[PDB]
Amino acid sequence: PIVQNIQGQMVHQAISPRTLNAWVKVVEEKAFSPEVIPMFSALSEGATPQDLNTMLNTVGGHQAAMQMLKETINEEAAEWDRVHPVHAGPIAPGQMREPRGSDIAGTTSTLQEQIGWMTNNPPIPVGEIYKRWIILGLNKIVRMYSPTSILDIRQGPKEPFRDYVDRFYKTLRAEQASQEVKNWMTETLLVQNANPDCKTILKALGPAATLEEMMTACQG
Amino acid sequence: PIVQNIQGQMVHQAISPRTLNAWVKVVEEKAFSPEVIPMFSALSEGATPQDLNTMLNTVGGHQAAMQMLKETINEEAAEWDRVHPVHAGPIAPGQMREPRGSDIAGTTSTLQEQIGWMTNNPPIPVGEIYKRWIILGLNKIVRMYSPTSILDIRQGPKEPFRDYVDRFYKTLRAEQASQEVKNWMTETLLVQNANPDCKTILKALGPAATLEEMMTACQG
Amino acid sequence: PIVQNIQGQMVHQAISPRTLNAWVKVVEEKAFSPEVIPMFSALSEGATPQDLNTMLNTVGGHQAAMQMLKETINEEAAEWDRVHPVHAGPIAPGQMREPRGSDIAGTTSTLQEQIGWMTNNPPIPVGEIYKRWIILGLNKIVRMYSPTSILDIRQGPKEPFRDYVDRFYKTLRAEQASQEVKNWMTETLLVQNANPDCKTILKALGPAATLEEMMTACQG
Amino acid sequence: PTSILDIRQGPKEPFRDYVDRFYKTLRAEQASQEVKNWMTETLLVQNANPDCKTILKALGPAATLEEMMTACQG
Amino acid sequence: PIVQNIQGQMVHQAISPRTLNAWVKVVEEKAFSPEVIPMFSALSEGATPQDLNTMLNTVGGHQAAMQMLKETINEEAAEWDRVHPVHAGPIAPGQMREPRGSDIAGTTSTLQEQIGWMTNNPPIPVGEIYKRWIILGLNKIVRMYSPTSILDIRQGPKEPFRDYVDRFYKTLRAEQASQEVKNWMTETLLVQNANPDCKTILKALGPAATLEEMMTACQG
Amino acid sequence: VNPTVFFDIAVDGEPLGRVSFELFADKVPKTAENFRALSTGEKGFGYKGSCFHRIIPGFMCQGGDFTRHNGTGGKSIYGEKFEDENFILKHTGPGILSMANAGPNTNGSQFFICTAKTEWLDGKHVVFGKVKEGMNIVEAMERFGSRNGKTSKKITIADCGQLE
């Protein structure tokens, strides 16, 4: 990453082996859960595109997901290059050139250009865009990985309310719909799909249903 | 999290990975228990709101509890906006404007603004406020994950007094209704639900009996 | 209403007996179907709050719905008066005073004040706000008359896809959800709730499913 | 035909017809609107069927007409 | 209670035991009748809040009603604090004490402070305010103690009009409503619920007939 | 309106002079009533015959421990201790009468009379009165104290009461 020295320049620092070891361990042990995206965004903070490419290449197995992620990165780079013209010709000294999409991806550049783009005035953050693209790809992957849909969740007769709401909110975290649709479904289908007894309990609870009130009502 | 230097000043520092790893491991391995709040308060001392949002989003599984915490944080942010209204008119030269209820959470503010808020003169403790909110949310979560109520406790004919008092104090620390009500409960409900033989052995010592003699009476 | 004379000043005109008879007839004949709101917005165009109150009072029966509409108008007027201060004191000639909520409701004003507020420069759409309130109330009413919910629609084994989608779109038009959530619903539940045969047909059809190709595929 | 005080719901008469007839007789009746505000909250829930009476009382005294309706809906 | 003492100087005179005995006896013998309110208001003329607290503590039984009274006193104190907060203003040349919700309720206000607030010029009407609060509470209590609703008052087949109108007016006085509602009820409900034998007699007299005419008509 | 109390001071029984105090009951009423009532002795106990146990020249004279006579005791008319009423008034100069305490919300009966401006005490001790008449009697008292507070002669409140 790029560690900021205390009262000094933001010196570049190679990714420690601990970061990559934790990353390969989580991607091996936990497969592709919704939370891995937060842990990936946590481990890689202020990292150059070279660091992110190293973190992605170290992943072993699940090569279909890696190919989908690379395809998503390519699509985002194509869109960026289409909606942003690239200048050429002689460039004034002390000012880096226009970052290209294939260049903002880090596939057609070295570490020096990335460090220069992340130190210019005003700063042009390549890391926060390449990480955004990787997060979009990982979101597509975790959506693809979800085994069951959100509309097809039904509580079992003996399965309690806690396990049902756990599965429901997990699938909701895996869902791809917009945030307003997410609020709509978590407002309606939660009580609309419960078991009939606690369904009538929550109907007696009426409007303004709040999760803690629901779980305190369905007790026993 | 900010850290003091040799000269005494503090500056932002990237969040350490084996903190995120330890938090994720303790959250999953111990699930939700009263001893997750001290660990959380110790792990993220001085953490920025971005670091707390990281430590919360990184928790895979138990998404219902995380949604409860998000709702509690949401309501807490609204109360802060309502209690204090921004003043109008000219602002003093040595002072600049404050954050909003939603920006205390760090949802719509960059990291540099958090660092400026935390190291201002005088410093503004946004991290401590958001940590208090998260601790309240975790208290409500561990309240929900309580498997019984305080009144239903009745020791079995064979269940030893040690296990009975352990279960009692466990669900009592998980109750957290109040502190003086807890003091009244530990006097009344503790003595009211004993097994008849050891019950009258405890009654032999009267209400002035302390817990040590209370247990060594039924001991052996 | 207020008919605009050709190349002249707009002249006030009493509501037509034909208009009022058509309104009371459509109310009596179709009860409260989702099209009564478009037909009401069509019949009442450029009408004063006096005209709208007359069109509402001529309705006979459904007094519960009428009282709910009046309560909605009262709530809207209260919100308007709360978020809009009312000025008082001596008022300059040629300039009408601040319209209160009870006046924009037409319960404490006169036709002269309504025409004055609708002829001022710049004009104040008192009619267009009172009609908006009436449309909100009629929307609440038509939502209350909804016999079945949208999430509980299931196609019969013999009931054809045309009838199924007719009922589905009728219930969707009656539904109260926002338009952003309304889209996901017609994208997913339409194909998720059909009979198995045409369900597999539309699944083979795959993404980008539109109503025309869906109905041409489920033929026979 | 009858006074507003005589309006009472039948044992199996649905809440729809009961509230319709009650509001129709109340509109036909002559009184100040201020008196009607107390008359509704005193007479609507009391004269209902016992099961629907408890159903409406579970909602609360100041419950609106639409919530009271959707309570015993069907 | 304080009383005008010769000459012209009010001094504190403690509540007499005979007054407390009269109050205990009237609460024992008459329970909670509508008339107690006047007896209470007349037994405690110009009483310090301590005297009213003594008179409310000396009651025997009816602890539920006393709890409603205390809670309504708390609510009135809360609203009073809300309606009378200290807004910034230039300080008055002359300072006089001030009664808080808790200073009015006699909870945290010493007897000397109340004597000061009463005998000072200008006087602070703490006694009358606390009396208004207690009278509101007693109105709540006596309207709760009503055995049957006023709408259920109906005459027996041979029950004389005397006892019928007596019981009807007693329940109507215990009932709570505005004066105009009572004016409408005495004209719409009284004649209708009478026995048909005398109902015909009252109808023969006229709708706007007074009480004495009907009473002497059905007399005997 | 604001009460005024006096103290007739004595140094080992020789009469020394009268200090009188205006108590700011219009801003610190509960604090001012406690010093007033302890001066009159109307609640049964009080200041009459207690001494200044700690006098530090150029800082303040402290007294009011009528139960233990050495700074470890004293009690209020509301119980042994009560809350810090407020901090409206500040330690602005000599003659300010402020409450001693053993940290926050621990006010009893000990008070101190400042003989200098002591702004560092602001926000930590409730101020509730000031010397009206007698400041040179407070100044002369300083001579019987020391850097650490120990006094050389017994300095007593020979009599005290309310004037107005």
DSSP assignment string, F16-73: EEEEEEEE-TTTSHHHHHHHHHHHHTTTS--STT-B--EEETTTEEEE--TTTSSSS-
With touching defined as 3 or more inter-chain CB pairs under 8 Å, the answer for chains E and D is: yes
Identity of residue A62: H
Nearest to A184 among C149, C177, C192 (CB): C177
In degrees, to the nearest 5, what angle opens at C-alpha C72 toward C-alphas C70 and C75?
110
Q: Could you tell me the two tokens for C10?
A: 């707009």
SS3 F15: strand
CA dist E114 and A42 (Å) reads: 64
SS3 B29: helix
CA dist E31 and C19 (Å) reads: 65
Q: What are phi and psi of F78, to 5 degrees?
A: -115, 0
Q: Could you tell me the two tokens for A77?
A: 């780079």
B197 contact partners, CB below 8 Å, separation of at least 6: none
CA B204 to chain CA centroid, nearest Å: 39
Q: Where are the alpha helices (DSSP H) in B101-152?
A: 101-104, 111-118, 126-144
Q: Which residue has the tokens 């009651």?
A: E59
Number of C-beta neighbours around residue D55 at 10 A: 17
* Beta carbons of C117 and C126 less than 8 angstroms apart: yes
Q: How far apart are the first and last CA of chain F?
A: 9
- From the candidate CATH numbers 1.10.287.130, 2.40.100.10, 3.20.20.70, 2.160.10.10, the one assigned to the domain spanning F1-164: 2.40.100.10
Q: Which residue has the tokens 């002369």?
A: F140
Nearest to A166 among B24, B57, B64 (CB): B64
Number of C-beta neighbours around residue B104 at 10 A: 24
CA dist A75 and F109 (Å) reads: 80
Q: Could you tell me the two tokens for F9?
A: 């001071």
Shortest Cα–Cα distance, A23 to chain B (Å): 10
Distances in whole angstroms, Cα of residue D56 to Cα of each of B30, C67, D39, D52, D68: 46, 18, 16, 6, 6
Taken as a whole, chain C contains a residue count of 220
Chain-chain contact of E192 with D3 (C-beta, under 8 angstroms): yes
CA dist C193 and C199 (Å) reads: 8
* Beta carbons of F161 and F4 less than 8 angstroms apart: no
SS3 E50: helix
Chain D interface mutation, best of C58, C59, C62, C63, highest count of D Cβ atoms under 10 Å: C63
Nearest to D19 among C64, C71, C144 (CB): C64
Nearest to D35 among E149, E151, E180 (CB): E180
Q: Which residue has the tokens 């200290």?
A: E86
Number of C-beta neighbours around residue D40 at 10 A: 16
Nearest to D70 among C62, C71, C144 (CB): C144
Which residues is F98 bridged to in the sheet? F112, F127
CA dist C198 and C211 (Å) reads: 13
C136 contact partners, CB below 8 Å, separation of at least 6: C72, C76
Domain boundaries, chain F: 1-164
CA dist E133 and D33 (Å) reads: 30
D37 touches chain C (CB under 8 A): no
Q: What are phi and psi of F20, to 5 degrees?
A: -125, 150
* Beta carbons of A151 and A181 less than 8 angstroms apart: no
Question: Which residue in chain C is spatially nearest to D73 when comparing CA positions?
Answer: C147
CA E78 to chain CA centroid, nearest Å: 20
Number of C-beta neighbours around residue C104 at 10 A: 26
CA dist A167 and F30 (Å) reads: 60
Identity of residue C196: P
Which residues is F8 bridged to in the sheet? F18, F159
* Beta carbons of F137 and F19 less than 8 angstroms apart: yes
CA dist F128 and F125 (Å) reads: 10
Q: Which residue has the tokens 């196609």?
A: C155
With touching defined as 3 or more inter-chain CB pairs under 8 Å, the answer for chains B and A is: yes
D31 touches chain E (CB under 8 A): yes
Number of C-beta neighbours around residue F31 at 10 A: 27
CA dist D57 and D62 (Å) reads: 10
A178 contact partners, CB below 8 Å, separation of at least 6: C180, C184
Question: What region does F7 belong to: left with phi over 0, alpha with psi -120 to 50, or beta?
Answer: beta
Cα within 13 Å of Cα(F85), Cβ side: 22
Shortest Cα–Cα distance, E77 to chain F (Å): 21
CA dist C103 and C111 (Å) reads: 11
* Beta carbons of C85 and C77 less than 8 angstroms apart: no
Number of C-beta neighbours around residue B179 at 10 A: 7
Helical pair E17-30 and E49-57, crossing angle rounded to 10 deg: 40
Which residues is F11 bridged to in the sheet? F14, F155
Q: Virtual CA dihedral for B74, B79, B80, B83, nearest 10 degrees?
A: 170
DSSP D4: G
List all residues of chain E from 180 to 199 with a beta carbon under 8 Å from chain D: 180-181, 184, 188-189, 192
Q: Could you tell me the two tokens for D60?
A: 């609360």
What is the number of H-type helices and E-type strands within chain C? 11, 2
Question: Which residue in chain A is spatially nearest to B3 when comparing CA positions?
Answer: A6
Q: Virtual CA dihedral for D51, D52, D55, D61, nearest 10 degrees?
A: -130
* Beta carbons of F10 and F2 less than 8 angstroms apart: no
CA dist A47 and A53 (Å) reads: 10
Distances in whole angstroms, Cα of residue D39 to Cα of each of B175, D27, D46, D71, E94: 46, 12, 11, 21, 52
CA dist E96 and F1 (Å) reads: 9
Identity of residue D58: A
Shortest Cα–Cα distance, C145 to chain A (Å): 18
Cα within 13 Å of Cα(C188), Cβ side: 16
Helical pair A179-192 and A196-205, crossing angle rounded to 10 deg: 120
CA dist E72 and E80 (Å) reads: 12
Identity of residue C156: G
Distances in whole angstroms, Cα of residue E116 to Cα of each of A116, B11, C208, E201, F76: 79, 59, 83, 62, 22
In degrees, to the nearest 5, what angle opens at C-alpha E96 toward C-alphas E90 and E101?
95
Chain-chain contact of C151 with A177 (C-beta, under 8 angstroms): no
Task: Please name which of C166, C170, C177 lies closest in space to residue C145, comparing C-alpha atoms.
Answer: C170
Distances in whole angstroms, Cα of residue F19 to Cα of each of F16, F114, F127, F155: 10, 13, 17, 13
CA dist F25 and F30 (Å) reads: 7
E18 contact partners, CB below 8 Å, separation of at least 6: none
Active site residue ranges of F: 54, 59, 62, 101, 112, 121, 125
Chain E residues with CB inside 8 Å of D3's CB?
188, 192
Q: Could you tell me the two tokens for A1?
A: 């990453």
With touching defined as 3 or more inter-chain CB pairs under 8 Å, the answer for chains F and A is: no
Q: H/E element holding F139?
A: helix F135-142
* Beta carbons of B73 and B133 less than 8 angstroms apart: yes
CA dist F93 and A99 (Å) reads: 69
Quote the radius of gyration of chain B (alpha carbons, Å): 23
Distances in whole angstroms, Cα of residue B188 to Cα of each of A142, B30, B151, B184: 53, 31, 11, 6
Beta strands in chain E (DSSP E): 2-3, 11-12
CA dist C194 and C216 (Å) reads: 15
Q: What are phi and psi of E149, to 5 degrees?
A: -70, 155
Contacting partners of chain A (3+ CB pairs under 8 A): B, C, D
* Beta carbons of C141 and C32 less than 8 angstroms apart: yes
Which residues is A2 bridged to in the sheet? A12
Question: Which residue in chain C is spatially nearest to D17 when comparing CA positions?
Answer: C62
D63 touches chain C (CB under 8 A): no
Q: Which residue has the tokens 């498997």?
A: B147
Chain E residues with CB inside 8 Å of F29's CB?
97
Judging by beta carbons within 10 Å of its beta carbon (0-12, 13-18, 19+), is residue D29 exposed, middle or buried? Answer: middle
* Beta carbons of E165 and E140 less than 8 angstroms apart: no
D7 contact partners, CB below 8 Å, separation of at least 6: D18, D21, D22, D25, D43, D47
CA dist A186 and E59 (Å) reads: 54
Question: Which residue in chain C is spatially nearest to A183 when comparing CA positions?
Answer: C181
Q: Could you tell me the two tokens for A110?
A: 């070295």
Question: What region does F58 belong to: left with phi over 0, alpha with psi -120 to 50, or beta?
Answer: left
Chain-chain contact of C61 with D27 (C-beta, under 8 angstroms): no
A6 touches chain D (CB under 8 A): no
* Beta carbons of B68 and B141 less than 8 angstroms apart: yes
Number of C-beta neighbours around residue F60 at 10 A: 27
In degrees, to the nearest 5, what angle opens at C-alpha E76 toward C-alphas E70 and E81?
125
F147 contact partners, CB below 8 Å, separation of at least 6: F56, F57
CA dist F60 and F147 (Å) reads: 11
SS3 B197: helix
